[PDB]
Amino acid sequence: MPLNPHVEALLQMMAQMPAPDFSVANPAEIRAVFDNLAAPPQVARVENIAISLDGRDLDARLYVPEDADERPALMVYYHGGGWVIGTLDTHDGTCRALAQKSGCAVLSIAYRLAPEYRYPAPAEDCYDALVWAKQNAATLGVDGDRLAVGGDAAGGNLAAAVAIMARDRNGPALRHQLLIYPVTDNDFTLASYAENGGGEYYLSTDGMRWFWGHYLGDTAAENAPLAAVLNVADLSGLAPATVITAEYDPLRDEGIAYAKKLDAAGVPVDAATAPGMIHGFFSMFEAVPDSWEWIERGASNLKRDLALE
Amino acid sequence: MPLNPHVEALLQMMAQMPAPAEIRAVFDNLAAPPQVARVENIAISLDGRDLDARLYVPEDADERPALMVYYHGGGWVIGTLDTHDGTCRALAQKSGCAVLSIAYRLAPEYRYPAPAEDCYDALVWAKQNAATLGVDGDRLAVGGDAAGGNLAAAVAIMARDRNGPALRHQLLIYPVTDNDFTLASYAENGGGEYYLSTDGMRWFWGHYLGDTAAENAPLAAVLNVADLSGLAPATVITAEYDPLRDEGIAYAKKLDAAGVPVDAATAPGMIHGFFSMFEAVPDSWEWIERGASNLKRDLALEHHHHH
Ligand SMILES: O=C(N[C@H](CO)[C@H](O)c1ccc([N+](=O)[O-])cc1)C(Cl)Cl
C-alpha cells in the first residue's frame, strides 16, 4: 500500500517550512523544534470560564500570556464563523497567538449562534459579555480600565457592533477594537466578491449569503443596524481601530470600506490589506508562517493602545 | 501580490479532502482540537517529585467515567502535555472515557528507569486518588504513542508484577519495544523521509539508557520480557511506513502468544505519529476510532436497569 496521499501532502508541507537550523541536535534544541511543530502557541494560563448572564450561560476562555503584567489589559474576543458556526476550540490557536504577541489577556466568548438565536441575540451576548468582564475584572485578574474588543470574520463584525453598543449605551470605555477581515455589509456585488468569492479561496460569496440569511432571518438588513455596521450613519466616537483585510478575501472591499468610514468620522485607524492572504489566515499560522507578521502587527496596535498610562 | 504559496498549498490540501447543526458538526471538527466537556490541569504529588498532569473528560462520559492514564510520545526525551493535547482530546472523545495525561520526567536529565517509574507511580496515584479525580478507580487503562506506548506497555508489566492497579486495557500506538535497528522496517522506513529516522531512534535510546545496556533494561526493551502472560488486553496499532513497525508487530505477536487478547493491525500508508496528524490526515480518525473503541469495550460500564 503506497503512502497515504494526505500524509504525502503533509510531508511536502512540513518540508516547505522555515528551517530552525540549530547547529546541533541536543535535547533543548529538539524540544524547541517539536514544541514549535506540535503544540499550540504557548501562554502562561488558560482558564475555562462560565459567564452567567441574565437569561443564559456563555462559555468563555481566558488566555494569559507568559510575561504579562501582574494585572494585564484585556481584549474580549469574538470568534468568527458567519454567526452560525465556530467554537472556543476552533479559535483557541488564534486567541493564544494574539495573547502571546500582545502581552494582553484575551477573553474568548462563545456567544449564542444563529439560526437558533438570530439577530439581535449574538451581538447582545457579545456586548453583555464585555460588560461582565468589566464588572468582574478583578476576579479574572485583569485591568478592566484597559479594555479592548477583537474578532475575526463574523467575529470582527460582532466586535465592531459591540464597540458601537458600548459608545451608544455609554458602556465600558474601550481602548481599541481589533477587526480582522470583518463582515461589515451584505452587498454581494462588490468587486472582491467577483474576484474572490468563487470558493477558490475557502470563503465563498454563497457562503456569505447563507450566513447572513441565517443570522438575519426575517429582519431586513436595513432594520438590523448592528449587522451591517457599514451602514451606520455615524461612526464617530468609536474606539481606535485596527482593520486587517486579506487580498483574496471576498470581504476585502467592505472591510476596507468600513476602515475608510471610521477614518472619515475621526477614529484613529491602522488599516492594511495583507498581500497574498485569504479569509481566515490569522488562524492559519501553523501552515502559513507569514500569518505571524500580521498577528504581530495587530497585537502591536493593541499593546500600544492598552499601555498602562 | 500573488497568492501566498503556503496558502495555496493549504488550499489544495483542503480541496484534497472528500466532503446548520450538521454543518457545525463538520466544520467545527476540521483543523481544530476535538471538543471535550472538561479539561483540568492537575498536579500529581509523588514520593520525591511532583508531576504535571491534564485530565480530559469527554462529552457524554458516565457520571463516574473510566480512566485511561496516557503517556505522550517523544522518544523519552521530548514532548509535553501541550504537544499531545489534540491526541488526548481525540481519544477521550472517541472512547467516552476520561483521559489523564502524564508529564513524566524526561531523559537524559532523568534516565531509565526514572520516566518509567514516574508513569507507573502516576497510575497508582490515579487509582488511589480516583475519588479526587471523580473517576471509577476499577475501570483503568493505560495508553500511549511511540515512546509513550513503550511506557504504557512497561507500566502494564509493572502493574502486573507489583500487584499494582488492575488494568482493563493497554492501548499501544506505534510503540517502541526494542533497540534492534537491524530489523526490516528500519532499512525500508528509517531513512528520514518518513518523519522518524533510525538515527533519530538511536539518539533517543542513547539518551534514555545512558550507560545502561539494553539487556539490563527490560522495562525499556519490553520485547525482551520473558513472560507476557496475564497482562491487560492490548491494542497495538502500527504504521506501514514507520521504522518501528516491525518491533511493534513482534510485541503484538508475543502478547497474543502469551494468551493476552490483542487487537493488532498495521495502518496502511501511514507514518509514525499519524494519530496526532488527524487535522491534516482525516484518515487517521479510522485508527483513532478503532483504538478508542477497544478502550470503550474493555472499560465497559456494568449493567444497570433503567425502569
Ligand atoms: O517521536 C517523534 N514524534 C512523535 C511521533 O509519534 C510524536 O508523537 C508527534 C508527531 C507529530 C505531532 N503533530 O504533528 O502534531 C505530534 C506528536 C519525533 Cl521523531 Cl520528533
Author numbering:
A (entry chain B): 1 to 270, 270A, 270B, 271 to 307
B (entry chain A): 1 to 19, 27 to 314
Quote the study's own text.
EstDL136 exhibits two different activities for the catalytic metabolism of chloramphenicol (Cm), a widely used, broad-spectrum antibiotic; it acts as both a Cm acetate esterase (CAE) and a Cm hydrolase. EstDL136 cleaves the amide linkage at C2 of Cm and thereby confers Cm resistance to bacteria heterologously expressing the EstDL136 gene. Structural analyses in this study have validated that EstDL136 contains structural features characteristic of the HSL family, with an α/β hydrolase fold and a CAP domain.
The EstDL136(ΔPMP/S156A)‒Cm crystal also contains two monomers in the asymmetric unit. Unlike other HSLs, which show ligand-induced conformational changes in the CAP region, the CAP domain of the EstDL136(ΔPMP)‒Cm complex remained identical to that of the unliganded form. Therefore, in addition to deletion of the potential hinge region in EstDL136(ΔPMP/S156A), it could be possible that extensive intersubunit interactions affect conformational mobility of the CAP region. Cm was bound to the active site of the EstDL136(ΔPMP/S156A)‒Cm complex. Specifically, the p-nitro group of Cm is located near the entrance to the active site pocket, and its C2 group points toward Ala156 located at the bottom of the pocket, a mutated residue for the catalytic residue Ser156. In particular, the CAP domain of the adjacent monomer interacts with bound Cm. Residues within 5.0 Å of the Cm-binding site include Phe34*, Ile88, His94, Asp155, Tyr205, Leu206, Phe214, and Ser286.
